[PDB]
Symmetry: C4
Subunit: 249 residues, 4 copies
């Protein structure tokens, strides 16, 4: 054994239940669209990220990300090298979860996706795990659409915890934290997905690149895999700072 | 009227009042589709779970069916001689709540079907009450989808009820568990619906068979009246051991 | 130059606790059966539920917040309240909802007229009246029209009493409200299809008496061979039947 | 940097979080309609209060919607000389909010606008920043309606923040105050697009008239910009008092 691995069971049974609701509900929309809604996803992710703090041990490991894994080193909260263990350790909850929703849904896309795992197009099923920015954007703006989609994932997250500026109640912190996430999938989720953490961009993207979809998950758009893995990083520490501007300093 | 009948009558009404918030939920989602929409039953049976959760002996037996009452008899809880009394007491209701979602939709299908109580095609009134698998799938994996739909609500039913590992609060349960059944239906409802408990599946499939439709309500998945009666009991043991091998042993 | 403390300071706060429910609920029915693009069915499923959770933060949190001329008749025969001061909960916040209808109407004076010609249409594909009162969408006679409103009433209380029986796992002292309209939210995804949920004799005698006054005519009280008396006698014999199915489980 | 002036920051943010959850959530039903929805406006708005709420000085420095601030001023629950501060410093939480949701969608807009800024017609844009009255609207309703939209905002606000008469618990505020405005959303925006607090109109309107839309943003409604700057001020002065008679006192 213990002393850092009772927690990596929670860090995993938290991210292995995030991507089942947040990233495993988009196949509820992009496969029937009259059984599933673009709401079923943006609402899936938040009110499923409730189960994801109901588990992780109250402050001692609940991140599920590498955008907020990284940031919680800006200041002396959780010094630097508790962090790299959670990045790779909590890709697994998103990789071998990305299967625990890929393997249970074969019969569904095999009558929707023909017999061919096409990456892009009119029966494309490669969106379900990765993040692809549609016709009307660039990376001039796709960097600033994850370093601001995660910059306020921090301002809005430091204001639901710090027991100084009057946040949530004791157990009434998951409902709001998931409700925090409903209203970004439904506000700025019309843009570079809302792959807002470097653990929905890559960890199920290196799960798509493995099952047989092709190299079009690492290249569709000049080179994408990197910005939802590099923008949340110097987006998070830059968003909770501009927050911490007003109370600290 | 003694101690242990004040245990069905308590678990009888949460298998007659979750079900009337979940059966008409579909018998309204798809029976009309204009007044009744695509969530329809995500938040109908979902939050119709919240109701019930506030209607049982506080947190000392509030299971609502014959499916989670079985994980909590082998994993140490509620000795087995208190397992089937609750199951049936519950089950004893699932029939008593459909047979009254009939007279509530009496002339809501006779102006819809004709006078024949059809189950498939242009007239579709037996996919509401029970479930019935779709045309894209066999039982090869609609069982694996029902020992995973009834084998992963236990990681949430533990992170919210168990009090050591930081949960929702005493009023805060129904709304973080009924808000699960909506978050369960926003991902994994596109497979078998969710027929997650054998107290929701059999007594309303025993009703579609006694109302006048006949034995075809069973002969639907060519045999589906045990796949969500043996996959759901075999997820509650397979999951309840995931959180307790995660934390415990 | 006189006293105004009494129960008339319940009356007054049943007034809003109703009035604020309606301008939320009624206000939303317009918002689908008048725009259909900026509005939906679901909007009333929950905009009526959280119209009632803002009814609650307007009346004593449990003692004064019925806002429903019937829950005021259910908690009288069981006994949680005396009788002779049952009027001034109906005749308060039921002429508290009548006068919320004329405040959703003259709030929509333009917004409707372009939707229904220049006609005060009761029945058709230009129907309006359904904003204020309810009508049975021809799916039924009264045989099911009284049996969807005294079981829809006795599916209410058993979910009311359970969150306010501070004995048997209710909400907190401060989350009663978020639930009890999210009762009404769900009433509109399981049961909200045939007669709607006109459970509330303050949403169905008061507003119907409004429309008939601003000119919808003597057709508001006929649609159903006469549909008015039902949700005014359908809830009272289904609240009394509604909350004795609970106290025959834990009471006496 | 630590006095009354560490409070524009409390409501720069609390207002900066009010626009950008909305202006981007109203530019989200309006720009794809298949990866978005209207509810997204009213609950991406209401729960974007929620986050507005948990940002500012606990309950008496967290308004953000400066027509409240007018009436929470004039009824004596604020020093009359600390009115302009909470506005203009939250009024800038609305400028530098529009400029910063016009940006995130810069690439998404011009693609379906070809290179030009239209205020009316079939390429309506600035309906998301400012507001404009429909086919079915005059200024008869143009004003009598924003006195009950800045009206009902109050009785339902005050009934929650005056902790005499059944309010929410001190964590339940922002969930059930944000959950208000989602109820004003699906009740009362199909007459005006509820501007309720002139915070929400005049600054991004002043933004969109600088943003090159030219003077049509002050035209439609013959002159529509003035009302949700004025009906709110002497429309929440009435949502206040009508409370303090019937309730309170």
């Amino acid at each position: 054994q213990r002393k850092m691995v009772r927690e990596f069971l929670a860090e995993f049974m938290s991210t292995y239940v995030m991507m089942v609701f947040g990233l495993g509900s988009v196949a509820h929309m992009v496969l029937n669209k009259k059984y599933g809604s673009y709401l079923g996803v943006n609402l899936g992710f938040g009110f499923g990220v409730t189960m994801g703090v109901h588990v992780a041990g109250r402050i001692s490991g609940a991140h599920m990300n590498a955008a907020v894994t990284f940031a919680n080193c800006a200041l002396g909260r959780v010094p630097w090298r508790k962090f790299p263990v959670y990045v790779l350790g909590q890709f697994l909850g998103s990789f071998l979860a990305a299967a625990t929703i890929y393997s249970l849904f074969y019969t569904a896309i095999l009558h929707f996706s023909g017999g061919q795992l096409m990456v892009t197009g009119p029966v494309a099923t490669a969106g379900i795990f990765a993040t692809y920015l549609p016709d009307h954007m660039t990376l001039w703006r796709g960097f600033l659409n994850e370093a601001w989609l995660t910059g306020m994932l921090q301002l809005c997250l430091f204001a639901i915890t710090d027991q100084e500026n009057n946040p949530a109640l004791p157990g009434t912190e998951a409902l709001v934290i998931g409700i925090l996430v409903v209203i970004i999938g439904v506000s700025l989720g019309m843009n570079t997905g809302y792959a807002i953490n470097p653990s929905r961009d890559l960890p199920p993207r290196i799960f798509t690149f493995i099952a047989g979809w092709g190299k079009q998950v690492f290249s569709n758009g000049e080179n994408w895999w990197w910005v939802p893995v590099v923008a949340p990083l110097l987006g998070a520490y830059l968003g909770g700072i501009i927050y911490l501007v007003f109370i600290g300093s």
